[PDB]
Amino acid sequence: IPELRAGLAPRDGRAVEASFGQSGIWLIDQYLPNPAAYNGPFFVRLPFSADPDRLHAAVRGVLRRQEVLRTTYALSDGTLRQNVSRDDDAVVFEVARYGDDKELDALVHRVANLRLDLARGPVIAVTCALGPANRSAVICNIHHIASDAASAGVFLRELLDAYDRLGRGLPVEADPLRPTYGDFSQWYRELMNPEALTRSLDHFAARLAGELPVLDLPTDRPRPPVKQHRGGTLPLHLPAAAADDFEALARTEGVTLFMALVAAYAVFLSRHTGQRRVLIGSPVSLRDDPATHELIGYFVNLVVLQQEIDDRMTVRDVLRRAREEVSEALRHKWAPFDKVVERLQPPRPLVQTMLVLTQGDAGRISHDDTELRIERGAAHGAKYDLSLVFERDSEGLHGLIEYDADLFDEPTVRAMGDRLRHLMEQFARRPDAPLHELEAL
Template sequence: MKTIEEFLSDLCSLDIKLWVEENRLRCNAPQGALTPVIKAELAERKEEILAFIRKNNVTFSSHNQPIRPVPRTENLPLSFAQQRLWFIDQLQPGSNFYNLPAAFDLQGSLNVVALEKTLNEIVRRHEVLRTTFASQQGQPVQVIHPTLTLNLPVINLQELPQVEREAEVQKLLSTEASQCFKLAEIPLLRCTLLQLAQEEYVVMFTMHHIISDGWSMGILIQEVAALYEAFSQNQASPLPELPIQYADFAIWQRQWLQREVLENLLTYWKKQLGGNLPVLQLPTDYARPPIQSFRGQRKSFALSTDLTEALKTLSRHENATLFMTLLAGFKTLLHRYSNQEDILVGSPIANRNWQEIEKLIGFFVNTFAKLRGFNARRNGMNTS
C-alpha cells in the first residue's frame, strides 16, 4: 500500500482537494476524478488522513473562509502564481515565453461595433484585464486601472487569392503571438480581427499568462458569445456582476498561505523535490544544449474513436480516470525510449476548486510534479 504522503500526492495530481472542517474530512474533486477505488481508499484511510493533516498543522481552516471583496486603498499583492511569472520576467525581460495566443473562426454577418463593445465590457467586468504590475521597493504590486478602452483593429485580406490569404493569416498569427508584453504597461491583452471574406473572419486574442490561463480562455469565449448576442440586438448585458475579482483571491491566498501552513507545505515539497532529480535522457540526434533555448514545438494528433472507447473501457476496468491511463502510457513510452526507471512528469491542474473563482478570468493554473520509479512494483508500490 502507498504511504499517506504518496496517496495524498496522487490525489493532488488529480486536482482532488481535502480539508478538515469542524473535525470532519471534506473533499472536493473534478467530475470523474473520484473513482470507486479512490472513494474506498478515502473511506478506509480517513482517520490516517485526518491524523496527517493535524500532525502537519495543515488544518485549512482559513482555506475554507469565503473569498470576500477587499478595499483597494493599499498596495495589492500578487498571487503566488503571478509572483512566479513576475520574477521570471525580471530575469528575462522582453520575452514572449508566457504569451497565450488564441484564434477563433467567425462565420456569418458580423457586427464589428457590437464585437468591440463586447470586448470592452469583458475588460470592464474583469479587473485583472485592466491590471499591470509595478515594483515598489523591490516588491511587485498589482496596479488596477479604473478604465481601459480597447480598439479592435480590422485587417482586410479579402483581395488576396486564397493561397496567399491563408499564408498571410498564418504569418499574422505567428507575428501576433510573438510580440512581447511589458508587465508594467497596459494593456496585457491584444485583439485583432482579420476579415477573409464578406462573411468570414478570424479574431485573434493574445494575453499574458500573468492575467489568464486556459480555463480563462473558456470564460472569455462564453462571455463573448453571451454579450455579443445581446449587444448586436441593442440589448443590455445578460451577465450578472462578479461578486469578487482576482485581486480579492490573491489577498485571500496570501492570508491563508502564511506562517506554519506555508512552512509545512514548503518543507514537504522541498523534501519531495530535493536531492538529485532525474533528467530525462532521450536518445536524440543532438546532445542537450548547455543553455535552454525554449524553442520547443507541439505535435498534435487525434486518436480514433475505437481506440478512445477502448481506453475509456480500460480506465473503468482499472478504476482509473482517462487522464491517469494516458499519463501511465506516456510515462511508459518515455521509459522505453530512455530506459530510465525514475521519470519526473509535470501535470498542469486547473486549481479552481472554489466556487467563487470559477467565473473569473485570471491566472490560477498550477503544475504538479510527479516522480514514480518503474522498479517500484518490486517494493509493492503502484507506479502510476
C-alpha cells in the same frame, strides 16, 4: 477549504499583492514568447461576419468586467503589486482580412508573437479578422501572467455576451458581486498560512529529496548555450479505437484518465531515457470554487509527479502507483511551485517535461444555438523539452506534442509520438502484462 468571497481584497483602491503564480511568472519574464501553446494565443471561427466597431466595444466591455485585463505589475518596497487601471481600452487591436486558413494563420501568428509589456500594458491583444462570405474570427493573446487555458472560454463567453448586449442597446458593466483575481490572490495567501504552507512544502520536499534525475531524452542536437525559444507541435494521431480503449482501461482499473496518461507517459519516458525515475510536471487547475469559473486569470499551480518504472512491473502495477502519486500530490496541490523549488534548492527547475489533460468541453462555447470551438496557435517558446497535451470529451480522447526545436527535428518527434500511441494501445489491451512483454514499434 474556505469559500472565495467578493471584497476579500480591499475595495478601497490599495493595490493587492500579486498571487503566488503571478510572482513566479513576473520573475522570469524576459519578453519571451508564450511558454506553451495549449494555454497560449487562441482564436475562434464565427458563423457570422462580426462588426469591427461593436466587436471592439464588446472587448472594452470585457475589460470592464475582467479586472486582470486592466492590471499591470510593479515592485513597491520589495512586494510585487497588481495595479488596476480604469482604462477599458488597454488592448492591442487591429482589423484585418483573410480568405483562407493560411491567411488566417498568418493573422494568428502576428497576434501570437506579440511580446506584451507587464509594467505598462496592454496585457491583451485582440484582432477582429474579417473572412469571406458570412465568416469572421476573433484572435486573442492574453499574457500568461493574466490567464490560463480556461481563461480563453471565459473571455469568449464574456465577449459574445457583451457583443449581443451592445447590439440590443443594453449596458455592459462590472458585476460587483463577482470576486476579482485580486480577491483570489488574497484568498490564496490566507489559505497558505505559515503552518499550512510548511506542511504542503514538507510533503514535496520529502517526496523529491536527494539527487533528482534530469530527463535524458535522445536529441538531434545538444542543448545549446543560447536558448532560441523555438517550439514545435506535432499531433499524436492516437486512433479513436485505442483512445476509447484507453479510457475504458482507466475506469475499469479505478484510476482517473489523468492517472492513466501519467502512468503510460512515465513508461514511455523510462524506456526512452533508460531512467527508472522520471519526473513529470502538471499544471493543476485551482478553479475548484465555482466563484472562479467566470474569471480570467492565472488559476493554475504546477505540481511535480515522480514515478519509478522498471520492466517487471505490470500495466496494473504502474496505474496503481500513479494513482497513489497523483492522489497525494493533488492533496497538496496548493503548494506554490516556486516555493517548492526554493525549498528543494536544485542546481539552477525540477521538471523538464509536462503532461496536461483538458476537458474538451472547456474549448466548446455555445452561442445563438451554435457551438463554437476554441483553437490554439502552434507557436510557443518551448519552456520544456516536450509537453504532452491531451484533451478528452464525449467525442473522444486526443493529444498533441509540444517540443523544443532546439533539441529535436520533427521526424524524431513523430517517431516518439508513434511509440507513445502504440504503448497506450498495448496498455489497454494487456493490463495484466509485465511491461517487458509489451513489444516496441
